[PDB]
């Protein structure tokens, strides 16, 4: 990775400096024992966040405001890094941005099947998946008009042309099929882009981590589809991410599975996932594995994967902050220790 | 019932926040847009409490609908169950309040 | 009366409305109406909230409860006026993101007055 | 021993004479086929009182199959729970003896369908009673699992308390004196901090707090591994100043009430955690083992009832069927299955998924 610093040395340095700002386990323990939300803000100000939240009154402080402000700081940092990126690194972060542009466009077709309202959706559309022509895409009243608005002039073109037809998405449900299949196509395309235009060790610490993302998507699809028998397995096979440790051998059995026991049999098939769903909830174990993979992404020094590792680590760090803030504001401190810290 | 209502509603709100944390995104808009039919109904039937024809409400939990139950991760289903229990408690409280008014 | 699902008017917090919808909610097919009336705090007009309360409790005719999510603090007069009848709607004030103290509850106020 | 050896139970009408070895006596042919598989088996059956209708018999058979599947699942769950508790030492299955006898010895007799189980009622009533008993055993197993989860939570809390000297949650680590003992109303005279770097930085932070925060006083230091730490003296008339100094010192303060009540509460919590862990690991473990043995006996009885029902459905009444034990060598399961398939010269209603024998059920 000697060539890595010709264009991304400063970006890597800034990202590592940001990583030094991630909340350590001691910081999380300190935040856990906060009496109230205002005291949580006071103790958080001692961290790298500082006076980020001082712009609002103590009585106006709430968990939603906590999430909004911390995620806004996250997005400011990411936008700064992207603005100071060049070439394949900028394309990689652009890909990251598409990862949430998928969700924004899927949210936007909602409210276009039933054109009840607009504008408020744009306000709710989080900026990490923003694109310049999204406001133009907002005005398109008809679903078809929005389809060609996103079929061209948006980075959504290859995914939409990959598996969709302009009249097909009317019948398909946004969450069950439309967003999940778009994530699918996104994952194959992103994995291919990594395999083509990335340097080692960022190579491996992207294929493994994107494979984990595909695996968690597949597990969620398998364990959510069983409650809705309307999804026939062949479409489910067309919905599974086609990438990861499960593919090829496991994803077929997950697609053909029709009950929780079958998914268990086809899931404990591979190593990293025995007892993974037997005990507890999927979300906590998935986030723990994500943090483990991110930590590793940080073990590497001259790898552009530190950007992705920092993004996911900082997002789960703000998620942990919001979880603690909820457990305090709701006074549900009995399950405040569900935060996941690997620093 | 009203003093326990705050506790039960804040537990349900914490369950919703756990669902949001698991799903990452704010599933509120998707849930609002995904409503298609009433899965929880109030059975308005009359009683005979002390010779007065008071009317109370019972819960029609119809699992066949499951309109929003197939969206999102399993945390969505867990939060749906928790909110269904909370809504049953609130329906009992509302029936008691209607009986009190009558 | 006509058994209907509980109404949902939440202007102090839309999270409560989202949770109630995730529980269960109904939208009128032919009339394109919806029981949900989620309102953003500081964005929906108080007159608009009163109009929604009238359209649900006074205009719509069925057998159902109608949650308020403590948003009736600004519309306390309308809540008291609508509380004069137990049907076709029965009011309720579930605890929203802002905790619902029993002091501001109209039903609790009546109970305390009758104590 | 060979406790890991699989078990496949079967039965056949008294007039049967398998075509695999024509001309041989039924018991002799079975033994020779068993000798061909190096196996052994013995008769084990009980004449049920079920004389219900064909539709009633079919419904009872379906219910019995469902109940047998449920009982097997419960037995497997109990065995897994015991193995987690380091009880299934020799093997995950058949290691624990049942009714003061090992698994094959218990399988060498099936008179359990008597007295405590011989309701003498219809097969439906006995099936319902066995299902209720299995549900009670499953509830006991669930209670044991809940106790184990509580013990795990208590152990996690104890580990968090003893996670480390720095940010220690165990108040017992700090001595009773110099910990706000007999605290004055206007002066707490105690504070706890865990500064980073060397202890000189902690002294400077104490020196910073030595003015405008509290009148000058001394307190002991703490190790906190490499990170510095020290008990500090903080006043209550200027408690806000001391808290502000601690926060601004970037020393990660962790001060908390060290009163006698807090120490007593912590000691009681630790004692309760240890007691719950010991209870779940010993008494709950023994109760779960006994319940697992009972559930194994009940599942064997239910399997016998299901085999009898099948022998009344597949084979024809009047009841004259002869059952055979399930004993087989550990590696001869496939050969035994092939031999049974060859010997199944009956039940042509299938193709010229269920076994075509009069009775065929593989266990463990």
- Check if the beta carbon of residue D85 is closer than 8 Å to that of residue D281: yes
Residue C91 phi, psi dihedral angles, 5° rounding: -75, 155
List helix spans (H) across C45-114.
Answer: 46-53, 76-82, 106-113
Best C17, C24, C61 member to test B by mutation, with max B CBs in 10 Å, is: C24
d(CA D195, CA D262): 24
Q: Which helix (H) or strand (E) holds B1?
A: none
If we measure between CA atoms, which residue out of D95, D89, D243, D257 comes closest to residue D174? D257
Burial class, A38, CB count within 10 angstroms (exposed 0-12 / middle 13-18 / buried 19+): middle
Using the Cα atoms of residue C16, residue C24, residue B90 and residue C72 in order, give the sign of their dihedral: positive
If we measure between CA atoms, which residue out of A123, A76, A131 comes closest to residue A102? A131
- Tokens representing D51 are 């004389």
d(CA D176, CA B75): 46
Length of chain D: 364
Length of chain C: 115
The number of folded domains in chain C is 1
- Tokens representing A169 are 């998405």
Q: Which helix (H) or strand (E) holds B60?
A: strand B55-61
DSSP letter (8 states) at residue D361 = E
- Check if the beta carbon of residue D339 is closer than 8 Å to that of residue D33: yes
If we measure between CA atoms, which residue out of D129, D142, D7, D145 comes closest to residue D67? D129
Residues 6+ away with beta carbon under 8 Å from B7: none
A-chain residues within 8 Å CB-CB of C95?
none
Between A and D, how many CB-CB pairs are < 8 A?
Answer: 11
B-chain residues within 8 Å CB-CB of C18?
16, 27-28, 31-32
Measured from the Cβ of residue A148, the count of other Cβ atoms closer than 10 Å reads 13
Measured from the Cβ of residue C45, the count of other Cβ atoms closer than 10 Å reads 10
Nearest to B73 among A111, A220, A332 (CB): A220
- Tokens representing D135 are 């549900």
Best A20, A23, A29 member to test D by mutation, with max D CBs in 10 Å, is: A29
Residues 6+ away with beta carbon under 8 Å from D356: D341, D344, D346, D347, D348, D350
d(CA D18, CA B38): 62
Contact A62 C97 (CB under 8 A): yes
If we measure between CA atoms, which residue out of A265, A151, A286 comes closest to residue A212? A286
The CA-atom distances, in angstroms, between A113 and each of A142, A169, B60, C24, D110 are 8, 10, 30, 21, 67
For D357, how many CA atoms within 13 A lie in the half-sphere containing its CB? 26
Nearest to A110 among B22, B33, B70 (CB): B33
Contact D247 A42 (CB under 8 A): yes
Q: What is the longest distance spanned by two Cα atoms in chain D?
A: 109
Chains that touch D (3 or more CB pairs under 8 A): A
Backbone breaks in chain D after residues (C–N over 2.5 Å): 352
Coil vs helix vs strand at A297: helix
Best A37, A175, A290 member to test B by mutation, with max B CBs in 10 Å, is: A175
- Tokens representing A25 are 């386990």
- Tokens representing A286 are 């998935």
Chains that touch C (3 or more CB pairs under 8 A): A, B
**How far does Cα D205 stand from its chain's mean position?**
53
Residues 6+ away with beta carbon under 8 Å from A180: A217, A221, A239
Strand bridging mode D221-222 / D7-12: unpaired
A-chain residues within 8 Å CB-CB of D69?
none
- Distance (Å) from the C-alpha of residue C6 to the closest C-alpha of chain B? 7
- Write down the experimental method used for this entry: cryo-EM
d(CA C96, CA C10): 8
- Check if the beta carbon of residue C88 is closer than 8 Å to that of residue C1: yes
- Tokens representing A325 are 């803030």
Q: At what angle do helices A282-299 and B74-101 cross, to 10 degrees?
A: 140
d(CA C52, CA C89): 13
d(CA D157, CA A334): 12
Q: Do chains C and D touch (3 or more CB pairs under 8 A)?
A: no
**How far does Cα B90 stand from its chain's mean position?**
7
DSSP letter (8 states) at residue A24 = P
If we measure between CA atoms, which residue out of D84, D139, D78 comes closest to residue D281? D84
Contact B68 C5 (CB under 8 A): no
- Tokens representing A265 are 């049999």
Q: At what angle do helices A5-19 and A63-83 cross, to 10 degrees?
A: 160
- Distance (Å) from the C-alpha of residue C26 to the closest C-alpha of chain B? 4
d(CA D57, CA D309): 7
Q: At what angle do helices A204-225 and A249-256 cross, to 10 degrees?
A: 20
d(CA A9, CA A302): 8
Between B and C, how many CB-CB pairs are < 8 A?
Answer: 129
Nearest to B70 among A103, A124, A228 (CB): A228
**How far does Cα B34 stand from its chain's mean position?**
16
D115 dihedral zone (left: phi>0; alpha: psi -120 to 50; beta): left
For D63, how many CA atoms within 13 A lie in the half-sphere containing its CB? 15
Residue A96 phi, psi dihedral angles, 5° rounding: -60, -45
- Distance (Å) from the C-alpha of residue A121 to the closest C-alpha of chain C? 13
**CA end-to-end span of chain C:** 31
d(CA A158, CA A154): 9
- Tokens representing A263 are 């998914």
Specify the residue for token string 């966040």.
A49
Q: Which helix (H) or strand (E) holds C92?
A: strand C89-92
Strand bridging mode D221-222 / D229-232: antiparallel
d(CA D108, CA D104): 6
Rg (CA), chain B: 16
Q: Which helix (H) or strand (E) holds A303?
A: none
Chains that touch A (3 or more CB pairs under 8 A): B, C, D
A-chain residues within 8 Å CB-CB of D250?
46
Between A and C, how many CB-CB pairs are < 8 A?
Answer: 5
Using the Cα atoms of residue A64, residue A65, residue A71 and residue A75 in order, give the sign of their dihedral: positive
B-chain residues within 8 Å CB-CB of A331?
10
D224 dihedral zone (left: phi>0; alpha: psi -120 to 50; beta): left
For A316, how many CA atoms within 13 A lie in the half-sphere containing its CB? 27
Q: Which helix (H) or strand (E) holds B24?
A: none
d(CA A223, CA A216): 10
- Check if the beta carbon of residue C16 is closer than 8 Å to that of residue C7: no
- Tokens representing C14 are 């839309």
Q: Please give the residue range of the domain that contains residue C33.
A: 1-115
**CA end-to-end span of chain A:** 25
- Check if the beta carbon of residue A262 is closer than 8 Å to that of residue A170: no
For B100, how many CA atoms within 13 A lie in the half-sphere containing its CB? 19
Contact B73 A283 (CB under 8 A): yes
DSSP characters for D175-237?
-STTSSTT--SS----EEE--SS-HHHHHHHHHHHTTTTS-S----EE--TTS-EEEE---ST
d(CA A304, CA A203): 9
d(CA A121, CA A136): 13
d(CA A217, CA A229): 19
Cis peptide bond N-terminal to D318, omega within 30: yes
List helix spans (H) across chain D.
Answer: 26-36, 54-84, 103-107, 123-161, 199-209, 239-248, 260-313, 333-343
- Check if the beta carbon of residue D310 is closer than 8 Å to that of residue D347: no
- Check if the beta carbon of residue D125 is closer than 8 Å to that of residue D56: no
DSSP letter (8 states) at residue D283 = H
Contact B22 A281 (CB under 8 A): yes
- Distance (Å) from the C-alpha of residue A220 to the closest C-alpha of chain B? 6
- Distance (Å) from the C-alpha of residue A63 to the closest C-alpha of chain C? 9
DSSP characters for A140-184?
--SHHHHHHHHHSSSTTHHHHHHH--TTGGGTS-IIIIIIHHHHH
**Considering only alpha carbons, which residue of chain B is nearest residue C104?**
B2
Contact C40 A62 (CB under 8 A): no
D355 dihedral zone (left: phi>0; alpha: psi -120 to 50; beta): beta
- Distance (Å) from the C-alpha of residue A65 to the closest C-alpha of chain D? 24
- Tokens representing D128 are 């319902």
DSSP letter (8 states) at residue A278 = T
Best A23, A26, A35 member to test D by mutation, with max D CBs in 10 Å, is: A26
Contact C25 B35 (CB under 8 A): yes
The CA-atom distances, in angstroms, between C110 and each of A295, C114, D171 are 59, 6, 49
Burial class, D79, CB count within 10 angstroms (exposed 0-12 / middle 13-18 / buried 19+): buried
Specify the residue for token string 């749906």.
B80
């Amino acid at each position: 990775g000697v060539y890595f610093n010709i264009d991304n040395g400063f970006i890597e340095g800034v990202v590592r400096g940001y990583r030094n700002g991630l909340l350590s386990n001691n910081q999380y323990i300190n935040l856990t024992q906060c009496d109230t939300l205002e005291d949580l803000k006071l103790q958080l100000s001692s961290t790298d966040y500082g006076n980020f939240l001082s712009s609002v009154s103590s009585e106006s402080l709430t968990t939603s405001l906590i999430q909004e402000y911390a995620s806004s700081k996250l997005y400011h940092e990411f936008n700064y890094i992207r603005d100071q990126s060049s070439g394949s690194t900028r394309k990689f972060m652009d890909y990251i941005t598409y990862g949430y542009m998928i969700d924004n466009v899927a949210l936007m077709i909602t409210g276009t099947i039933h054109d009840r309202d607009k504008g408020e959706i744009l306000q709710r559309c989080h900026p990490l998946g923003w694109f310049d022509t999204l406001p133009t895409l907002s005005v398109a009243t008809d679903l078809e008009s929005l389809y060609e608005t996103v079929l061209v002039d948006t980075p959504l073109a290859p995914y939409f042309k990959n598996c969709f037809d302009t009249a097909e998405e009317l019948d398909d449900m946004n969450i069950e099929i439309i967003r999940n299949k778009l994530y699918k196509a996104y994952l194959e395309d992103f994995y291919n882009f990594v395999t083509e235009e990335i340097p080692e060790p960022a190579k491996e610490c992207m294929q493994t981590l994107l494979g984990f993302e595909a695996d968690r998507r597949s597990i969620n699809i398998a364990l959510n589809s069983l409650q809705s028998s309307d999804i026939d397995p062949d479409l489910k096979s067309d919905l599974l991410p086609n990438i990861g440790k499960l593919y090829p051998l496991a994803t077929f059995h997950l697609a053909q599975a029709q009950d929780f026991e079958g998914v268990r049999a086809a899931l404990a098939n591979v190593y990293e996932y025995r007892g993974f769903l037997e005990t507890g909830n999927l979300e906590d174990h998935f986030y723990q594995l994500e943090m483990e993979l991110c930590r590793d992404a940080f073990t590497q020094q001259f790898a552009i994967s530190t950007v992705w590792a920092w993004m996911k680590s900082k997002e789960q760090e703000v998620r942990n902050i919001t979880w603690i803030a909820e457990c305090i504001a709701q006074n549900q401190r009995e399950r405040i220790n569900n935060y996941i810290s690997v620093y | 019932a009203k003093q326990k209502m705050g506790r039960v509603m804040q537990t349900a709100a914490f369950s919703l926040a756990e669902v949001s944390y698991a799903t990452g995104e704010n599933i509120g808009y998707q849930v609002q847009e995904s409503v298609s039919t009433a899965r929880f109904k109030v059975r308005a039937r009359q009683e005979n409490v002390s010779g007065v024809y008071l009317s109370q409400f019972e819960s029609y939990i119809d699992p066949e609908i499951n309109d929003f139950r197939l969206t999102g991760l399993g945390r969505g289903g867990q939060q749906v169950q928790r909110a269904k229990e909370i809504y049953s408690r609130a329906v009992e409280t509302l029936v008691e309040l209607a009986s009190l008014q009558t | 009366a006509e058994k209907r699902t509980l109404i949902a008017v939440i202007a102090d917090e839309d999270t409560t409305t989202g949770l109630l919808l995730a529980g269960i909610g109904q939208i009128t097919p032919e009339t394109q109406e919806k029981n949900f009336f989620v309102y953003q705090e500081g964005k929906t007009t108080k007159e608009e909230i009163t109009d929604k309360f009238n359209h649900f409790t006074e205009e719509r005719d069925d057998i159902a409860i109608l949650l308020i999510n403590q948003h009736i603090a600004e519309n306390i007069r309308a809540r008291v006026d609508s509380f004069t009848n137990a049907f076709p709607a029965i009011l309720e004030i579930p605890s929203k993101d802002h905790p619902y103290d029993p002091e501001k509850d109209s039903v609790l106020k009546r109970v305390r007055k009758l104590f | 021993l060979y406790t890991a050896n699989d078990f496949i139970l079967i039965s056949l009408p008294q007039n049967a004479q398998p075509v695999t070895a024509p001309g041989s006596k039924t018991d002799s042919w079975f033994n020779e086929t068993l000798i061909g598989g190096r196996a052994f088996v013995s008769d084990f059956k009980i004449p049920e009182f079920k004389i219900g209708s064909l539709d009633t018999l079919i419904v009872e058979s379906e219910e019995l199959s469902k109940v047998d599947n449920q009982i097997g699942a419960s037995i497997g769950k109990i065995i897994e729970i015991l193995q987690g508790l380091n009880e299934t030492s020799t093997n995950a299955y058949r290691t624990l003896p049942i009714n003061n006898m090992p698994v094959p010895e218990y399988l060498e007799n099936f008179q359990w369908q008597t007295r405590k189980f011989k309701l003498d009622k219809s097969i439906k009533d006995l099936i319902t009673l066995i299902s209720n008993e299995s549900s009670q055993l499953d509830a006991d197993v669930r209670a044991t699992y809940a106790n184990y989860n509580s013990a795990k939570t208590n152990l996690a809390a104890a580990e968090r308390k003893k996670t480390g000297d720095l940010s220690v949650r165990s108040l017992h680590d700090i001595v009773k004196p110099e910990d706000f003992v007999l605290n004055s109303e206007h002066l707490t005279t105690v504070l706890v901090a865990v500064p980073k770097s060397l202890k000189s930085d902690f002294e400077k932070s104490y020196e910073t707090l030595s003015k405008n925060v509290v009148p000058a006083s001394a307190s002991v230091i703490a190790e906190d591994a490499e990170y510095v730490l020290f008990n500090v003296h903080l006043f209550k008339k200027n408690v806000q100043e001391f808290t502000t100094a601690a926060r601004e010192k970037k020393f990660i303060p962790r001060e908390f009430n060290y009163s006698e009540e807090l120490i007593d509460q912590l000691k009681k919590e630790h004692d309760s955690a240890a007691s719950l862990e010991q209870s779940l690991r010993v008494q709950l473990v023994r109760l779960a083992k006994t319940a697992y043995v009972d559930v194994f006996i009940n599942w064997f009885h239910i399997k016998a009832l299901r085999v009898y029902v099948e022998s009344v459905l597949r084979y024809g009444l009047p009841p004259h069927f002869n059952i055979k034990i399930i004993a087989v060598p550990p590696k001869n399961l496939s050969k035994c299955k092939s031999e049974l398939i060859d010997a199944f010269g009956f039940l042509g209603g299938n193709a010229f998924e269920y076994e075509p024998f009069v009775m065929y059920i593989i266990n463990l």
